[PDB]
Amino acid sequence: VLSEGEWQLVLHVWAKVEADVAGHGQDIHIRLFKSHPETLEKHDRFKHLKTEAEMKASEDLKKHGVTELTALGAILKKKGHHEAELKPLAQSHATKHKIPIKYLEFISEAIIHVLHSRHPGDFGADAQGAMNKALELFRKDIAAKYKELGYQG
Numbered sequence: 001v002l003s004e005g006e007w008q009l010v011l012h013v014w015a016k017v018e019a020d021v022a023g024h025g026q027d028i029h030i031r032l033f034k035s036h037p038e039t040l041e042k043h044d045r046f047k048h049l050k051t052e053a054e055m056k057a058s059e060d061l062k063k064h065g066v067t068e069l070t071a072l073g074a075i076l077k078k079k080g081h082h083e084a085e086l087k088p089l090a091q092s093h094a095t096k097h098k099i100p101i102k103y104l105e106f107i108s109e110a111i112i113h114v115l116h117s118r119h120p121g122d123f124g125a126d127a128q129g130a131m132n133k134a135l136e137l138f139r140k141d142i143a144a145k146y147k148e149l150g151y152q153g
Ligand code: HEM
Pocket: 039, 040, 042, 043, 044, 045, 064, 067, 068, 069, 071, 072, 088, 089, 092, 093, 097, 099, 103, 104, 107
């Protein structure tokens, strides 16, 4: 459980993401793909992009990042009361994309990295701790929904 003050820090930095959702989503994917190339495999639509500049020039990848971050933002804004938003996400990611929980850890790391790279003055230790707790809650709750659908994270 997050305190009200922790949620406020999460949403404070999230408003900064919302000033440029597409750019943040591009940076998060590029970091994710570089740190963990097997995650680029899971994105079988983008597996073929060879360089950072090709990745940045992909309109489809940019649009996909906005779709992803929009769903995450909608979840974060519910401050843990996110069953209705999380359930369809768990359904698609368990039964179609087949994204293990470890890959959600990988993208959580990339989110933290990009947020600290772009917003260090609004993303110090306490804000990082709050965002880490909110992403941990997200991963814990989606893992439980994964199991309800069969097959483990
Ligand atoms: C912050 C966590 C994530 C959120 C909120 C998220 C959200 C979404 C949303 C909203 C879609 C479109 C609708 C859907 O199919 O559910 C989507 C599609 C997808 N996501 Fe995620 N996602 C997350 C993490 C990941 C990770 C970690 C991977 C893979 C390593 C991943 C791989 C995919 C793929 C492969 C698709 C569909 C792409 C296509 O149509 O080609 N997602 N995601």
